[PDB]
Ligand binder design. Structure first.
Ligand SMILES: [Zn+2]
Lengths: 174, 86
RNA sequence: UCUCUGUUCACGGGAUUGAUUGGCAUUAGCGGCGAUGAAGGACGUGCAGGAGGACGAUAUGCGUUGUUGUUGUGACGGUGUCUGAAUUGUGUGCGGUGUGCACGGGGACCCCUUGGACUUAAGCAUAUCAGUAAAGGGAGGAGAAGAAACCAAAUGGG
RNA sequence: GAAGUGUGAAAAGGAGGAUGAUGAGAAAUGAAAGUGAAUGGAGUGAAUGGGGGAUGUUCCCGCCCGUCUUGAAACACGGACCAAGGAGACGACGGCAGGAUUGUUUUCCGAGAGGGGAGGAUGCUGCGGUCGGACCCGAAAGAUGGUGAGCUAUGUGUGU
RNA sequence: AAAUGGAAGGGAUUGAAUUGCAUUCCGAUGCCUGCGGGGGAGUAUCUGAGUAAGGGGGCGGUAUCGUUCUGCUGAAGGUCCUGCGUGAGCGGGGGUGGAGGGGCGAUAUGUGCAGAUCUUGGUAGCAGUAACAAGGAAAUGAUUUGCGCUGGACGAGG
RNA sequence: CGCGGAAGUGUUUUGUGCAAGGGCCGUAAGGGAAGUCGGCAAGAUUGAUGUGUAACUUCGGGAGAAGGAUUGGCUCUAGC
RNA sequence: AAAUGCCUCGUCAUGUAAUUAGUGACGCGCAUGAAUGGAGCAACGAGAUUCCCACUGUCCCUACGGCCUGUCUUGUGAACC
RNA sequence: CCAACAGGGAACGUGAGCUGGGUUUAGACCGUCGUGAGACAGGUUAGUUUUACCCUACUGUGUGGACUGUGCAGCAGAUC
C-alpha cells in the first residue's frame, strides 16, 4: 500500500501505524495533527480527549479563512524574537497572536485510533508506553469519491468527499 | 403551467407489445405498428441508415438457414434410410 | 506559525517506451432462403446458475462414422414449444372434385416506372446539378443486349 | 447510442494495522499540472526577466502575449492551469524550369471557293493556373421520405 | 474668473527659470584604428535594419530498400548531474527500469503547436466558504409524560 | 365554513440565546394625505332585529339607497 | 379643444390661500359627422378619470416590543469567475 | 413664510441604492394618409427592473502593563 516517508534508524526502538483511505475530511484532519509531534504518546491521547469535550482547541493555521475567534487559541502564539546575524547583520522578528481555533471531533476520533494501535504494538516488543515520543506525523490526500446535488432550473452539480491517508512513527529517546 | 405541472397528467398508455416484432410500438387506437408496419403483409421500409443494420439477416439465430448451408456443400444427400426410395 | 523560493523522501494522475486471438485495404474464387412453413420475435431448457454463448419438451444436447480416455472432440444425419407471408385465406391453371402454382425475406451490382431541391451562372427566370438522390414494381450468379428494313462512298467492310 | 486491454516463467500470496513468508523482482513502466512531511535561505516589497558581478537582494535597463488596424500596455476582442490530438496532402489536363534516354522532326494558309515546302518525342521532381468536400472549423434557408391529439384545441358515444 | 491636492520634470534657486560669449570639459550601437564571423567579387578588396512576399544552406518524427554495428556482464523510456553547437539539436555519468535499440546513402509521408468562446481527459484557487440538517424530555427506554395533522378503501401508473 | 376537541396515524431525547441589517407581525402623544405620478399600503365598515329611505327610470328597478337606534347574565310572565 | 384641435397651458365661468388637472359654455372643426353607423347612461363593470365624508405611522419624525434568520458550534459540503 | 429664499461642476455626480410617472417590442381605440399588407417626433389606454460569498476603498474590531511627554491628523456653532 502506501509507503512511509520516514527512515527509521535503530528499528528496535520504533513503532509504526497506518490507515489508508480514511473516510474523514482531509483539511480538518491535517489541522488537528499539526501540534502532535514531539509530544509523549500518553499526553497526546489526553490532549485529543479534551478537544472533544471543548476545553482545549485546535489552532487553525493554514486552512482557516473566516474561522471563529476564541480565547483558548492564544496558547499557541509565537513570541517576539531577536534574529542575530542573518548574514552578519542583526535583525528583529515580531510575533504572531493566534486568535483562531476550533474543535473538530471527528478528526480527533480517527487520530485516537491510530495512536491506540501504536500503543498495542509497543507491548509486543516489550517497551514502556510511557517512554514513547512522537517523531513523525503525516496526513495526505486520497482519491476522490463522487456524488451529486440538485440546483434550480433543472441543473446538477458535483457533491463529493475528500478522504486522506495517515501515518505515524514513535520512538524511545534513550 | 405548461411545464412541471403538466407532467403529472401523463398516466395513459397508447401502445402495447407488437406481436410481430416485440417493441412497445403497436398503436391501439390506430391498429398499426410504427416500427414494422404490422398488419401489412410486408415489413416497413426502415427510417434511417443505421436502422437497416439493427434488424436483418444475421442479427438473430438463423435456425434453419445454417443447416441448409451445411447440406449444400455435400450435394443434399438426405436421411440414409430414405435414400433407397430416391 | 504564515507568504515566497532551494533540496531530499512520500502522494496524486495516467502521458511515454514496448506488446496485441482486434481493425482497414488490394487480389482470386463463390453468391448456396421460403406453403416440404423462411428471415425476424416471445417464452423456456444445467442435481447445485445470474449475464453471454449454446440449445428446443429427443431442450446447457440425441444417432452414425473417425480420432480418443479426456472439462473429450471432428465430419455428416435427425429433432425443433408458441408465433411470424401466417393461410381452415385470397387469386388462378388442369381436371370435373381431385391435384398444382403465386404471396414473404433480401435488393451492392442488373431491368422497367416515377422523379427533386441544395448547388453553378459571382444576382436570376431558360440552362446547370441531372434523368442523378429519394420512392415503387420485377429478376439472377450475373443481368440486359444480339445474327443488319446496318455502316458507308474504297480495289470497300460485315 | 457510449466508456472500459496487461500480477508472475510458475499461485509458488496477499488484501485493518503491526510482525512476516514466497519470488530474479512485491510485481508492467509511471511524465506534467497540483499536494503533504522534514530541513536550508529569504520577506512585509505584486512577482517574474536581460546586462554586469556573485553561495538571495543593493548599480543600469525592462508595461502582456497573439490578432484586425493609419495607429494597442490599452476603459478593443481570445487566453485559470497541464498532457495528448489538431489545418495547402491526393486525382485529372495543360504550361514553364532543372534533369534522363533517344533523334531521318513537322497536315500549312483561308468562313469558304481557292491557294500551297520548312527539333521534337517519352518518362522524373518542383512551382503557377482550373475543376474536384479541395488549407481547417461556421449560417438564416430549400427538397425527398417518414412519426405524433398520453400536453393542449374543437365535434361526437357513455358515466360522475 | 472654475469646478478631487499639484506641477519651468521634482527639491530648490534673487540669476542654479533673462541676455551675450568660449581659452575648458562630458556625452551614441555614428566615425577612425587592431582582431573574429557571414555574404558578394574579376581573388591586392568591398559590404551587413526590415512587415507583406520570394530564394539558398542546415536540424528533428515514423517506415522501405541496401550497407555497417550494438543488448540480460542490463536496451528503450523516465529523472538528476555534466560536455559540445551562433541555433534547430546532439553526447557522456549515477540512481530507476526489465526488453530490445541504432549510424550512413537513396526512397515513401496522416512529418514539428501557445493561441482557433479549439476536441477529449486530469487538476488548482475561490473555500471548509454558500446551501442544507441538528424534531420536547426522563442515567436505562416493550415503561412514564409533551407536541403535529391527513385517517381508511377501488381504478391508472409501479 | 371559520375558531376549538376525539378516533386513527406520525415523532425525538448532550449546538447557541439571541450586535447591525433583513423576512413576517404588534402598539403609538399632538396633527390628519401637508406624503406620492397616483390614498400604493394600512386603517376603517361588517352578524341579526325595529326604524327610515332621494334623484332618476326601459315602471321591472335604483335599494341592504343614504341616515339613525337596539344587543350580556339572572329570575319570571304571555301566545300556540 | 371630446380616448378625434396642429397652433395651445385656446377664450369666459366655476371648485382652491394658490388649478398645464376636473366640470359647464362658446365654435371657420390642421384632420367631427350618420349600420365606416350619428345622437343617447335606465340596469350592469377586479374598465379609465376628478372631487366630498369617514379613517388612519402615507408623511411631520421616528420610538419600543415579538417570532424566524444573521452572529457562534458539530456534521454533510457546491457554483459563478 | 423668510436675514435671504444666488448661480454652477463632480461619466448632462448617484438604477448589483430605490422608484418606474416620461420614454417604454409583442394587445387595443381614434384622427389623417395608403387599392392593400401597413405608416405617423399625432393623441389615448394595458404592459417581468436578475446576480457580491472575490480584490481594493471605507466603517468599526483585533495585533500582550502603570503614569506621562510631543509630533502628526481631524475640527463647530451660526442667525434672528
Ligand atoms: Zn412490429
Amino acid at each position: 500500500g502506501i509507503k512511509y516517508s520516514y527512515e527509521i534508524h535503530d528499528p528496535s526502538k520504533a513503532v509504526k501505524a497506518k490507515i489508508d483511505n480514511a473516510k474523514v475530511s482531509f483539511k480538518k484532519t491535517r489541522e488537528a495533527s499539526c501540534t502532535l509531534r514531539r509530544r509523549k504518546v500518553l499526553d497526546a491521547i489526553q490532549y485529543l480527549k479534551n478537544v472533544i469535550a471543548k476545553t482545549e482547541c485546535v489552532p487553525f493555521r493554514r486552512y482557516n479563512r473566516g474561522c471563529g475567534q476564541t480565547h483558548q487559541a492564544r496558547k499557541f502564539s509565537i513570541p517576539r524574537r531577536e534574529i542575530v546575524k542573518a548574514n552578519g547583520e542583526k535583525k528583529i522578528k515580531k510575533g504572531h497572536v493566534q486568535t483562531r481555533g476550533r474543535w473538530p471531533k471527528k478528526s480527533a476520533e480517527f487520530l485516537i485510533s491510530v495512536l491506540e494501535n501504536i500503543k498495542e504494538n509497543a507491548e509486543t516488543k516489550g517497551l514502556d508506553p510511557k517512554d514513547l515520543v512522537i517523531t513523525h506525523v503525516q496526513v495526505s490526500k486520497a482519491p476522490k469519491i463522487f456524488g451529486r446535488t440538485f440546483r434550480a432550473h433543472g441543473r446538477v452539480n458535483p457533491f463529493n468527499k475528500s478522504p486522506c491517508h495517515i501515518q505515524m512513527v514513535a520512538e524511545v529517546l534513550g | 403551467s405548461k411545464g412541471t405541472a403538466s407532467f403529472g397528467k401523463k398516466n395513459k398508455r397508447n401502445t402495447e407489445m407488437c406481436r410481430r416484432c416485440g417493441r412497445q410500438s403497436y398503436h391501439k387506437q390506430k391498429n398499426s405498428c410504427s416500427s414494422c408496419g404490422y398488419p401489412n403483409p410486408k415489413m416497413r421500409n426502415p427510417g434511417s441508415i443505421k436502422a437497416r443494420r439493427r434488424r436483418t439477416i444475421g442479427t438473430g439465430r438463423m435456425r434453419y438457414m445454417k443447416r441448409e448451408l451445411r447440406a449444400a456443400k455435400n450435394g443434399h444427400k438426405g436421411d440414409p434410410i430414405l435414400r433407397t426410395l430416391w
